RNA sequence: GAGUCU
DNA sequence: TCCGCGTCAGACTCGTAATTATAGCATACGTGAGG
DNA sequence: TCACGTATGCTATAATGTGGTCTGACGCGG
């Protein structure tokens, strides 16, 4: 059974009699009175095999002692009843007939092959024309179609001087002809006169596809078929339903409509019938042949009884019912059953409940096992029925096979590896499954009746496998995030909050107790509350040098409950820790400082026993929710009534015509969001320090303790976005569009929502729960696209020898910084040396982890940006090192070799947009943007630093901006960046570049809903391109008569002005141009559509001055639906429609030629002399200036960036950090955490193809792609041995087309494309040698990774020894 | 008879099964009254009165 | 359905996700006891044999 | 071992060459029917030889030592 | 959908400039349905089912 | 151009000779005595009538250019049998084999499981009787109500109406859009499970093993009888021709074997435990 | 619902699905993926292989169960053997190049 | 085709 | 610039089994039993 | 050599070109 590769190649006419075993000559099934086989029929037993297991028809000859005996009467052999799934047969087609896959499957392939259009093609086959096959006299031109009045011409003229023909015979002999030595030397030796682009794209195709057709071993005869195969029998069987009524599949109705066409195509031949009866019987068999190979391909496919077409051959392969991704990629498993899960709070953490009778069913064949063993049962059929009388001896042996034998439990859906845990069952009475509450949260299980499925590892490897990788206690931290999913929760922390919390005096306060245990004493005895504040005596262990602990012991000043609370604190971790009140945020850091600190077992410990008393002490507390506890603010109806009065003022003024609609549109959200705000901070405000108590003093005030607040403050449940809709005001709804309503909803839940409130309320409800229906499949597809990318990807050495690395700079993105150098860079090899300020000492060695201990250090010295070594980096041919990946996030310990990275890459990236799509849909009401981002104001004292920046001075005095990416950094007393910020165009600075600010200064100040478009020079200005009616529009109104302009873009423009681009050209007094300072530019800004303009022609203006305003409406909350097609495109590398230019090769600019108003740039490097040329449009106002030092990848035109660009010019590391950082900025947006190294390891993936520019000393030579590992091998040999170097270039591709790329075709028949993927592999002759992880799951066997990866390398050796 | 986590309904926001919850209780606080007074046998105009 | 006492109040995380926490009083009453009648066919039919 | 393997990974290194060594002795008591080095106490093959491996007995190694002196001490009596 | 005429128009779906081409659809209840429709270059078009 | 098969097809027969009377008879007069022009030219001009006939004897069993196929067929052999010594007329007579051959060959083909001739049309003898029945007993008519019109048996009546009953595929979906068909519901009750499997190899090695417990000349007649070491089922009378050679003393040691045994299941644990079984 | 061994399909010679049916559960690809990215290869191939498909390795193992050595006599899925036909039958030499 | 968990 | 083709999350529970129409009888063709 | 199910054969008024759903989208070639 055991082999090494498959191949696919074009079956030879020969090669599919081999297969058959008989020819089926009748379409016959069965007879309807003695139910059998049929003579030479689909079913027949004379060729396919038996029904029975050894039994021949008449049945002659039975069971073994006939062994290999071929009956004589009925003609069948005395074997398996197996061998009717395995026996193939065949059918000898009269006439040829093409196969569709090898013409209909663009590119054609007998189309391409021949150089002749698949249209041209077709009419042959349905004898529309004759094409001629070989002119003797080349009078006739060949693969020249002749209409059937064009053919009566040459045939009384010329006759035999010439072959045309028509039908499937025609284009089979016209393959026949064809030599592929011949043809392919002209290709080549033709091409060097012309070189174009797509000439030399086809031709060379064609030569490739030529060269590949001889080396493959196929012929382009095969193309056209004279042989069809038949399925077995038992892969399209005829069974009986329960009743008498039979079932087939559509396999047979559609081989039964292509034997009758075939067998009535011999009978007209034989019967010399005129052509015109004989082609319409050929069209017919070539209809019956495409619709059995693939239905709905070629026309309108056939359809049977139900109206629904016939299920091809094509279609048991092809997409998502095919084998692949339903039978092969995924299965239905035996040891396996599923139920309603329900809580086990008194369970361990390594531990489920499961049902007596659910467990007694799985584990049947160990009860079997163990029976005998005790001497219970003597055979099998005995123990059975023991155990089917469920008798007590079989309850007792059942306990004895579960201990220390776990169990794995999923959950749909299984979107990261977390969502399938082991645990030790605990057997239970009910039928329900009793889950963990801790591992609630990577399963996203909640008990309002999800369902959970059971599967038993069988094997020993398999136990070990559950207990040492799958097991619960094993897997606390996230892979995702160096940080634990194993967190309490709901009750839980709302009882160590109100545990630890403390209150004004209560009962005894200051009072003065033994330890921790005299806490508990005082509390259950009844004379302290949990929230009085004590001195206690407690002794805290803190960790030495040396692994020794050091005791301590110190009056702490902390309430009972915290002294309480310090009893299930293990010994390694200081009393600070429960010395606050802790929350959901404080509680998730006890169990990661106590992970780093002590080890897996005493979290374990620690995180049970914080889960046991928080609920108990929840309990206790007996915390409720009443409608008082909804606290509303006396001042609502005055908040309101304010800004009612605001909003009706812009309506007013919208009736008089001085504000727009879409300007009161942004106007009025900017009010009722701010009120909505206004009311909220009310809410919290006279919620939060509402508390005011008498103390044994006199009167002091401290945090409330309104049930609803705890409950939301602690972060149980809730928040305060969802307390805004139950006390205070219930905010913007969202439009079903995404737009925001322009009337909010000005009550709250307690109050109740009227009619309309409602009404507005439905809007958003249901478009979030349509979300969750829908949009979760954008999601998931991308989960499914990311993980076939990376798949193969596995750690295969321990360290590559590399150098190389990506420079992490800490992400300090407005104001407060987004995420330290030390979350980036922990757990990473540091790539280079990387030392303190003083260089005059090394502090890091260059292959070393960064443990948070060394992160800690990298604060001391304040370590700005650290290089560090990436997956990208990693010159590892075969998969990843070690070192360049890092620590393992979910063990918080270097990775193991073996450990398949790939997959936990793509599912950290897909889950979190799969789960948050489905989360605030349900969850969401309302809408919730803030976009009034008006003015910077700086926090720290600091010089103003702006770079990419080039302003202008106004009239006002005010240094204004005429740049689009100018950004504003915050420069402290040493000079590092603290503070960093956005300042966008048209903004007006409050001090210019260098000058002092003190803080809480606004630095700069600008209008958010309006891009304005500002001048750099000073005069007056001219109208140009600027005819109403065809470019743009006007409107005026009385007395006096002001009127604006309203420039037209494509949408709204006519034909006539379509060529003309608006702009407001600036000019001096006397009427002339006005040169923009120190350029050979006259003073032009170009208007963009919907451009607004007030100043009309003829108007005096200074530099500084808005020349026209255009609309800034976007009103969506950006969820992650918004943003997550921004992923998708990142991830699959689309150029966006404008890309920003950038120059290619570092050297002096000069400008060039013009084409009417589009740029030429015939820049001339100073080392390469030679040229290089490039168009660009007219309406690009560009960033550089001409005649200046441009280096590679400099920034010509404003906008966004294609990746390929950033690859192409400024190397791997540049195009990883454009990905990784946009990508992120998408999650970060919406609070998701994802390691910068997941979203390497896909970049990997895309930087996985390369051109070769330069020959080589193989065959690779140029324009063939190949993948980087291969090229390197071959460069290995190369630079020690010589010969012909191999220059490169580095390519990009996006995940869809490098997960096709692979050389794989199992992998890629798999993914998508199964129709194309198989015939291009056909052709050339593939053959997969079975590398990934798909392919070894298709076919059956060990992961090539994980636990397998010993065995895998070890029969690798064993083919390499001899 | 039955317990259910007061943190089952901030995050729902679904505030009416509070209000149902109180308004059951006084509901039920007049059926236990009338109980009484049935159970006591007091008078049909007292009943009547209440 | 039917109408009962209910105390809103965290229990030993009995009531963690919105699992629910019922006195056996409740299932002693027998008050949400269901009756599910089931229709099963017994059909002779005609083979071949 | 009973709960935790992560003083059984430690002794090893790797959590997948573990599994590897922890099967190979399950087996040898599963069939070969060897006799525990730690006291059973009770506890299915696959734990007693977590525990053999926590405590440093079982190993890559010395599995390789134990299965050539039990095999070649046959081939001597062979040759 | 209701039978009789619905006026209806693709904005930015149809092309590239965004020209908004509106349409008419005569919708029966049995028969054959009858389209107008506008092109890029504003010229009218009548499409039969 | 037109690329659709049937639609090109009836654009060729279109440009056809449309035969007259006298002029059917001249070109059959030398297509019986043989001429290669003749029934070409004949059965090219003619196939406008078979596509009209097809066009009727539609939506039944075959697409539509299945019927012209054979309906071709047919008008040849009313070619090859065609009397122009008759002054009748060949539209007439070409008539009764075109719609013949269509009727006659849809009876075979448009069943799975092949009907034949003499099953269909009994069959539409009870259901052209059905929808006379059918008229007057508003509800359609019993398979008794059917039988007692024609005084013939229910059994005749029930077995050919039951031949009747159509066959669903097994990739027709239950669910709708994409569920699961009846593959996904439907056993292959040959392949017996590994319950099943396991079973009969530990009933049977069971039995290797209770045979080398019972005595040596008992386990050798009781053994080779039954054909579970021997290579044939052989019979009391039958056991002689190995070395036993007798029907008395075979008998009395076959169930002598059998008694030994049978109390060696009641210890064991079976006997009337797998007396159910 | 619960299933140790049971009805097998047709073609696919896989378990039957749903409690109507008593049969197995689906492991989509979605949980192959889980056990690939923690490592346990031998969890999946049981899964893969004895669980579903493998007709030698299903009978074998129980039986490797019952005689309570817990082995992994594995083999080749009926349904790559279907894949095989499937692709064969289409006129596409698909053939097993061995070591 | 009507549902259940996301 | 327009037409064609290819993608479009993961498990579960239930539920049922549809329709039509082919004339009529005479010699020929194959297998199986009895004289 | 019949018995039995199965198949082949022929019918002469003339008759001679066929007839279910009407709505996706966003991307990416030729
Ligand atoms: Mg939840
Ligand atoms: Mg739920
Ligand atoms: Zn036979
Ligand atoms: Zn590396």
Known sequence: ?1362 | ?50 | ?49 | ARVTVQDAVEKIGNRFDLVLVAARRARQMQVGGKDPLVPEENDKTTVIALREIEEGLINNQILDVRERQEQQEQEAAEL | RSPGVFFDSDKGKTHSSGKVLYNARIIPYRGSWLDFEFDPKDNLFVRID | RVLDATQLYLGEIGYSPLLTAEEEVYFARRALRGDVASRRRMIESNLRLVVKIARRYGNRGLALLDLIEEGNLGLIRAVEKFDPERGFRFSTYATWWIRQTIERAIMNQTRTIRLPIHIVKELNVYLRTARELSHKLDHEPSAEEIAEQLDKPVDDVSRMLRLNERITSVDTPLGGDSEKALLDILADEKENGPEDTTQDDDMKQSIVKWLFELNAKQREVLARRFGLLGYEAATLEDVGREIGLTRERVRQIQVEGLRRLREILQTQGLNIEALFL | ?99
């Open chain 2, 1 to 50: 008879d039955i317990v259910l986590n007061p943190l089952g309904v901030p995050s729902r926001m679904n505030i009416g099964q509070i209000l149902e919850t109180h308004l059951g209780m006084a509901a039920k606080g007049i059926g236990d009254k009338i109980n009484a007074m049935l159970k006591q046998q007091q008078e049909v105009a007292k009943l009547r009165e209440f």
């Open chain 3, 1 to 49: 359905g039917q109408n009962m006492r209910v105390a809103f109040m965290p229990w030993n995380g009995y009531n963690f996700e919105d699992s629910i926490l019922v006195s056996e009083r409740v299932v002693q009453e027998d008050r949400f006891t269901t009756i599910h009648i089931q229709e099963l066919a017994c059909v002779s039919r005609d083979t071949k044999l």
């Open chain 1, 1 to 1362: 059974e055991e082999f090494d590769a498959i191949k696919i190649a074009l079956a030879s006419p020969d090669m599919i009699r081999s297969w058959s075993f008989g020819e089926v000559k009748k379409p016959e099934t069965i007879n309807y009175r003695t139910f059998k086989p049929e003579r030479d029929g689909l079913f027949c037993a004379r060729i396919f095999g038996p029904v029975k297991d050894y039994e021949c028809l008449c049945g002659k000859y039975k069971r073994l002692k006939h062994r290999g005996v071929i009956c004589e009467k009925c003609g069948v052999e005395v074997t398996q009843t197996k061998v009717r799934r395995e026996r193939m047969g065949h059918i000898e087609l009269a006439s040829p007939t093409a196969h569709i896959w090898f013409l209909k499957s663009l590119p054609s392939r007998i189309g391409l092959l021949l150089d002749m259009p698949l249209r041209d093609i077709e009419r042959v086959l349905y004898f529309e024309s004759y094409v001629v096959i070989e002119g003797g006299m080349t009078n006739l031109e060949r693969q020249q179609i002749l209409t059937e009045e064009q053919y009566l011409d040459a045939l009384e003229e010329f006759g035999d001087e010439f072959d045309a023909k028509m039908g499937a015979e025609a284009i089979q002999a016209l393959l026949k002809s064809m030599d592929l030595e011949q043809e392919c030397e002209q290709l080549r030796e033709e091409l060097n006169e012309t070189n174009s682009e797509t000439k030399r794209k086809k031709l060379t195709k064609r030569i490739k596809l030529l060269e590949a057709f001889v080396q493959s071993g196929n012929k382009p005869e095969w193309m056209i078929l004279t042989v069809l195969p038949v399925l077995p029998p038992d892969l399209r069987p005829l069974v009986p339903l329960d009743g008498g009524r039979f079932a087939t599949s559509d396999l047979n109705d559609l081989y039964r409509r292509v034997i009758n066409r075939n067998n009535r195509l011999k009978r007209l031949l034989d019967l010399a019938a005129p052509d015109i009866i004989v082609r319409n019987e050929k069209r017919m068999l070539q209809e019956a042949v495409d619709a059995l190979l693939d239905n709905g391909r070629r026309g309108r496919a056939i359809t049977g009884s139900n109206k629904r077409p016939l299920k091809s051959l094509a279609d048991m392969i092809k997409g998502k019912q095919g084998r692949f991704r339903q039978n092969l990629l995924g299965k239905r498993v035996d040891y396996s059953g599923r139920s309603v899960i329900t809580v086990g709070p008194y369970l361990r953490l390594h531990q489920c409940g499961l049902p007596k009778k659910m467990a007694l069913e799985l584990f049947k064949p160990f009860i079997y096992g163990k029976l005998e063993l005790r001497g219970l049962a003597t055979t099998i059929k005995a123990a059975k029925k023991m155990v089917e009388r469920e008798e007590a001896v079989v309850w007792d042996i059942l306990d004895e096979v579960i201990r220390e034998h776990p169990v794995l439990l999923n959950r749909a859906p299984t979107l990261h590896r977390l969502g399938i845990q082991a645990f030790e069952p605990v057997l239970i009475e009910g039928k329900a499954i009793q889950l963990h509450p801790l591992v609630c949260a990577a399963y996203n299980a909640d008990f309002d009746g999800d369902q959970m499925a059971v599967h038993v590892p069988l094997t020993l490897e398999a136990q070990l496998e559950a207990r040492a990788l799958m097991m619960s206690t094993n897997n606390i931290l996230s892979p995702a995030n160096g940080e634990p999913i194993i967190v309490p929760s709901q009750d839980v922390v709302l009882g160590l909050y109100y545990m630890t919390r403390d209150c004004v005096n209560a009962k005894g306060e200051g009072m003065v107790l033994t330890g921790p245990k005299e806490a508990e004493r005082l509390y259950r005895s009844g004379l302290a509350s949990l929230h009085a504040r004590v001195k206690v005596r407690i002794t805290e262990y803190e960790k030495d040098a040396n692994g020794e602990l050091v005791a301590k012991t110190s009056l702490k000043d902390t309430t009972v409950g915290r002294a309480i609370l310090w009893m299930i604190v293990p010994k390694g971790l200081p009393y600070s820790i429960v010395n606050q009140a802790l929350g959901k945020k404080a509680i998730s850091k006890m169990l990661n400082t106590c992970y780093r600190i002590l080890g897996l077992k005493p979290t374990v410990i620690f995180a049970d026993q914080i889960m046991y008393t928080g609920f108990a002490y929840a309990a206790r507390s007996g915390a409720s929710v009443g409608i008082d506890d909804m606290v509303i603010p006396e001042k609502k109806h005055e908040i309101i009534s304010e800004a009612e009065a605001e909003v009706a003022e812009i309506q007013e003024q919208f009736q008089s015509g001085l504000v727009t609609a879409g300007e009161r549109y942004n106007k009025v959200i900017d009010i009722w969001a701010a009120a909505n705000d206004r009311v909220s901070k009310a809410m919290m405000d006279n919620l939060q320090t509402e508390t005011v108590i008498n103390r044994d003093g006199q009167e002091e005030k401290q945090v409330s303790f309104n049930s609803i607040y705890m409950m939301a403050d602690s972060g149980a449940r809730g928040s305060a976005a969802q307390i805004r809709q139950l006390a205070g005001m219930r905010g913007l709804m969202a439009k079903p569009d995404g737009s925001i309503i322009e009337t909010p909803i000005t009550a709250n839940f307690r109050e109740g929502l009227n009619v309309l409130q409602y009404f507005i309320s439905t809007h958003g409800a249901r478009k979030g729960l349509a979300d969750t229906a829908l949009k979760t499949a954008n999601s998931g597809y991308l989960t499914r696209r990311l993980v076939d990318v990376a798949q193969d990807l596995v750690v295969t050495e321990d360290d590559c020898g590399t150098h190389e690395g990506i420079m992490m700079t800490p992400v300090i993105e407005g104001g407060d910084v987004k995420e330290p150098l030390r979350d980036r860079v922990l757990g990473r090899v540091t790539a280079e040396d990387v030392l303190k300020p003083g260089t005059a000492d090394i502090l890091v060695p260059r292959n070393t982890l960064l443990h948070e201990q060394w992160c800690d250090l990298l604060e001391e010295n304040s370590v700005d940006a650290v290089k560090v070594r990436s997956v990208v980096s990693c010159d590892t041919d075969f998969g990843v090192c070690a070192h360049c990946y890092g620590r393992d996030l979910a063990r918080g310990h270097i990775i193991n070799k073996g450990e398949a990275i790939g997959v936990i890459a793509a599912q950290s990236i897909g889950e979190p947009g799969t789960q948050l799509t489905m989360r605030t849909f349900h969850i969401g009401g309302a809408a919730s943007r803030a976009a009034a981002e008006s003015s910077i104001q700086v926090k720290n004292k600091g010089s103003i630093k702006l770079s990419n920046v080039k302003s202008v001075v106004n009239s006002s005095g005010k240094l204004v901006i005429t740049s689009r990416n100018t950004e504003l950094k915050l420069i402290d007393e040493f000079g590092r960046t603290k503070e960093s910020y956005k300042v966008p165009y048209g903004a007006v600075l409050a001090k210019g570049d260098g000058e002092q600010v003190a803080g809480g200064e606004t630095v700069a100040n600008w209008d958010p809903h309006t891009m304005p478009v500002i001048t750099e020079v000073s005069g007056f200005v001219r109208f140009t391109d600027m005819i109403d009616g065809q470019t743009i529009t006007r409107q005026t109104d009385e007395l006096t008569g002001l009127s604006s302009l309203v420039v037209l873009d494509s949408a709204e423009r006519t034909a006539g002005g379509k060529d003309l681009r608006p702009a407001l050209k600036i000019v001096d007094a006397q009427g002339n141009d006005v040169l923009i300072p120190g350029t050979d530019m006259p003073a032009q800004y170009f208007l963009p559509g919907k451009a607004i303009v007030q100043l009309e022609d003829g108007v005096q203006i200074s530099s500084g001055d808005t020349l026209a305003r255009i609309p800034q409406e976007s009103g969506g909350t950006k969820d992650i639906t918004g943003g997550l097609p921004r992923v998708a495109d990142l991830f699959e590398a689309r150029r966006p429609k404008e890309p920003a230019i950038l120059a290619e090769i570092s050297g002096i600019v000069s400008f060039g030629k013009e084409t009417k108003g589009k740029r030429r740039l015939v820049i001339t490097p100073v080392d390469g002399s030679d040229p290089y040329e490039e168009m660009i449009p007219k309406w690009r106002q560009l960033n550089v200036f001409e005649g200046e030092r441009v280096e590679r990848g400099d920034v010509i035109s404003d906008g966004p960036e294609a990746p390929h660009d950033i690859l192409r010019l400024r190397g791997v590391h540049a195009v990883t950090r454009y990905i990784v950082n946009e990508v992120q900025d998408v999650y970060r947006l919406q609070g998701v955490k994802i390691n910068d190294k997941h979203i390497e390891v896909i970049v990997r993936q895309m930087l996985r193809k390369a051109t070769i520019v330069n020959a080589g000393s193989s065959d690779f030579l140029e324009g063939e792609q190949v993948e980087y590992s291969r090229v390197k091998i071959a460069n290995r040999e190369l630079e020690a041995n010589g010969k012909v170097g191999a220059t490169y270039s580095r390519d990009l591709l996006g995940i869809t087309k490098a997960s096709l790329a692979t050389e794989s075709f199992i992998s890629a028949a798999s993914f998508q494309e199964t129709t194309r993927v198989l015939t291009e592999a056909a052709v050339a002759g593939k053959r997969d040698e079975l590398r990934g992880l798909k392919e070894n799951v298709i076919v059956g066997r060990l992961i090539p990774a994980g636990t397998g990866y010993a065995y895998h390398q070890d029969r690798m050796r064993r083919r390499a020894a001899g």
């Open chain 7, 1 to 99: 619902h619960a299933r140790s061994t049971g009805s097998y399909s047709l073609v696919t010679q896989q378990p039957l699905g749903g409690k109507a049916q008593f049969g197995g559960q689906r492991f989509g690809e979605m949980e192959v993926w889980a056990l690939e990215a923690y490592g346990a290869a031998y969890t999946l191939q049981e899964m893969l292989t004895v669980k579903s498909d493998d007709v030698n390795g299903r009978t074998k193992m129980y039986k490797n169960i019952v005689d309570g050595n817990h082995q992994m006599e594995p083999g080749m899925p009926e349904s790559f053997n279907v894949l095989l036909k499937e692709i064969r039958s289409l006129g596409i030499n698909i053939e097993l190049e061995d070591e």
